Amino acid sequence: TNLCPFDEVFNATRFASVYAWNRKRISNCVADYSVLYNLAPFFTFKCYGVSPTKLNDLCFTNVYADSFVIRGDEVRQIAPGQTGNIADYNYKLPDDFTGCVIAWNSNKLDSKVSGNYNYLYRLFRKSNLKPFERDISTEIYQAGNKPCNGVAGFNCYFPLRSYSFRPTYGVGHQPYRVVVLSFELLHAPATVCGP
Amino acid sequence: SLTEENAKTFLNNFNQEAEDLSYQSSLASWNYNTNITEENAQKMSEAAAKWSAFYEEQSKTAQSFSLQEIQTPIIKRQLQALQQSGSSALSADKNKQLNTILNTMSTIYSTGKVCNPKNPQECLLLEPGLDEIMATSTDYNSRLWAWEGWRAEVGKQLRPLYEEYVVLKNEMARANNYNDYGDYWRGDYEAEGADGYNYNRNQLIEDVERTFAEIKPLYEHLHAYVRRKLMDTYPSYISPTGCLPAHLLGDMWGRFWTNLYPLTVPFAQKPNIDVTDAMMNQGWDAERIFQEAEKFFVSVGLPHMTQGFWANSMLTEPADGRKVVCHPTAWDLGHGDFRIKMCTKVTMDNFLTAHHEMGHIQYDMAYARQPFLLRNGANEGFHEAVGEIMSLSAATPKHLKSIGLLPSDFQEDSETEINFLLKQALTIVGTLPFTYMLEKWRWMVFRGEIPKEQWMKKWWEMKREIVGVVEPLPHDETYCDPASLFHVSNDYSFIRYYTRTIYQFQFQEALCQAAKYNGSLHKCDISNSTEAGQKLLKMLSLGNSEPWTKALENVVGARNMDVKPLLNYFQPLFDWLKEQNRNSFVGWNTEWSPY
Ligand SMILES: *[C@@H]1O[C@H](CO)[C@@H](O)[C@H](O)[C@H]1NC(C)=O
Ligand SMILES: [Zn+2]
């Protein structure tokens, strides 16, 4: 029995920023979503396109596992057909998204008394992101009609900002680790079946 | 591209960094006020310095966007709130002069002693050892001595400082497209942009004189009753037709007549029930007081208290090692953080202070969905009027009989109602004429209608005709009597206490008519009523994003100050005063003088 490649994306030690979310491929394994109950008390197991109530007996050719970290008030933006800052500049999902999202509070690990300035996000951008698109550019966002010349003056800001988590914030500002599983159904031999 | 998108991006970039710098300074201030040491006071300085520097740097740049091509009200309001640079319009030298002048009056008011014509080794300052003479001391020739010595020692050096403070502040406001500094204080009530809710600045004057001219008969009846009651302890020093002396009241300045209750009481044989001797025989704690207050807000339709509140708030005095400033306050640190710092004892006065303090938390918790510039109250009187109705409701004998503090044997009586309404009469109606007179004098002084050689010539005739108070000793043109108050030696608006009272009763009558109540207004509460309490949450959700004339219309229905719940609150008292003031003369004349 070649078990799932799990226990390496959930119980990780270093997550990624939302603007540089991490993606892992899953194939030639056995899906075993039966141990996620032993995880955090998370209230987010929201699935679309499939049914979560004891319907994990399908076969897929590939699975894409994305992972990142956001705040507590943005987990509602990781859903098909949504708007906001994260959904438009950081991570966009299509309307026909088949798969689901899990989000668990990570205040005891991702928060610092002096401020966790490690995780970043994108605040300004010329256009919105396509479904499953990713940008890692650090160009000066020219807002007005005058050139920027590489320096950030007036109407020319840096597009990346930080979170600065602290253990004294409210539940809407505490960090949350998010994992998005997407299922692919191609014309290839489906090798991800599960018991 | 255009001014709109540029302003939107500018406001976003502002709100990004402003809400993180405004958190460290507040956290440092909390850590200092809770653990005051030699290091916290120094750590609280750099955070505030950096925050002020960032605020001035952002406000100096938020001026190239002309407020003429903006059609959206939210962006226009945020730009108007960011364009008020305050005292940053003065020059370099004048700023330092105004800074060193304001600190001089502050350190003069803080320090300073008094000397008696008797043995002078007793030097008394504003420490509570002195105001006790003006609070509980009945014997004559001592209250008058203290009242004269206060305006004699510390009132002389504040005259050469106020004369420059007036002309300096009139120039700082003249650079902000105003007329004087009196018009600067009246600008908080300026609400522009609406369909009918437009409120002009100068109207604030015409709305106060129209309001004070309606509580004149009730104040006159209360004043005549107090004057007739004071003649039983000072028979040879009180005239039954003239006004009352400036001293001999229940305060150092006469702002609150609360200390006249042991002298001016309708029925002395009544017990005036107190629930302080009710938590001893059953067992209470500082946590039970704040838990019975949380249950009050969840029975009306308001959210619970966050888990970070009960873990980060100081609800009692520390055991040892630490020291606190000993003042009940509600801190809104930001980023979803709300705390309360208050040393709580098991009494009735502390039981009602918890409700007043949590009334600020429920207000702060509710407008947190605003872009960091609309997270305030409608005006300066809206924030403090919400915490007053919560204490008004929790003090009724009905709320005390539904929590186990009062037994189901004593219901009510007509005598305790009068004993309670009179004690509340010399706390609200007794300060409104004083506040109105002081604010009118300050406005006329800042405008120019009172010359420099007529200050202590028009300050006393107004107190004679408006407040009905005469001076015991003559005061020539070398004193400064209003400067003796704390709110005058330091820059502080005093009209915020006049409107806050009115709004206190406009909210209570509108929130007691949504719970199907028909009895007296001073006997109703909003407990166990979801409708009466959901209309309040609708007003407590705008901050200053909407004009204050519109937020007031959502809770009470009126667009302006229309004060006749106050005349309905003191209805059983105004009728009892007219039955007692029969063989007397209701009124005063500004001609009599003691000496
Ligand atoms: C992570 O650790 C928990 C600890 O009990 C364990 O139950 C779980 O199987 C581990 N793996 C995952 C993917 O949660
Ligand atoms: Zn208050």
Author numbering:
A (entry chain B): 333 to 527
B (entry chain A): 19 to 613
The article reads:
The Omicron variant of SARS-CoV-2 carries multiple unusual mutations, particularly in the receptor-binding domain (RBD) of the spike (S) protein. There are 15 amino acid (AA) substitutions in the receptor binding domain (RBD) of the S protein, nine of which are located at the binding interface of the SARS-CoV-2 RBD and human ACE2 (hACE2) receptor, namely K417N, G446S, S477N, E484A, Q493R, G496S, Q498R, N501Y, and Y505H. Receptor binding is the key step for SARS-CoV-2 infection. Omicron BA.1 was found to display a broader host range than the prototype, whereas the Delta variant showed no alteration.
Compared with hACE2, eight substitutions were observed at the mACE2 interface: Q24 (human)/N24 (mouse), D30/N30, K31/N31, H34/Q34, L79/T79, M82/S82, Y83/F83 and K353/H353. Structural analysis showed no significant changes in the molecular contacts of N24/Q24 and N30/D30, whereas N31 of mACE2 was found to form an H-bond with R493; however, a repulsive interaction existed between K31 of hACE2 and R493. In addition, F486 formed a π-π stack with both F28 and F83 of mACE2. RBD, whereas Q34 of mACE2 formed an H-bond with R493. Both F83 of mACE2 and Y83 of hACE2 were found to be involved in hydrophobic patch formation. However, T79 and S82 of mACE2 were not implicated, while L79 and M82 of hACE2 were. While K353 of ACE2 is a conserved residue among the 27 ACE2 orthologs tested, K353 is substituted by H353 in mouse and rat ACE2s, which enhances the binding of mACE2 to the Omicron BA. RBD via an additional H-bond with Y501 of the RBD. Although neither G496 of the prototype RBD nor S496 formed H-bonds with mACE2, the relatively longer side chain of S496 shortened its distance to D38 of mACE2 and formed additional van der Waals force contacts compared to G496 of the prototype RBD. Q493R, G496S, Q498R, or N501Y substitutions in the prototype RBD independently confer binding capacity to mACE2. Notably, a synergetic effect was observed for the four substitutions, where individual substitution only resulted in weak binding (1.3 μM–44.8 μM), but which enabled strong binding when coordinated, with a KD of 16 nM.
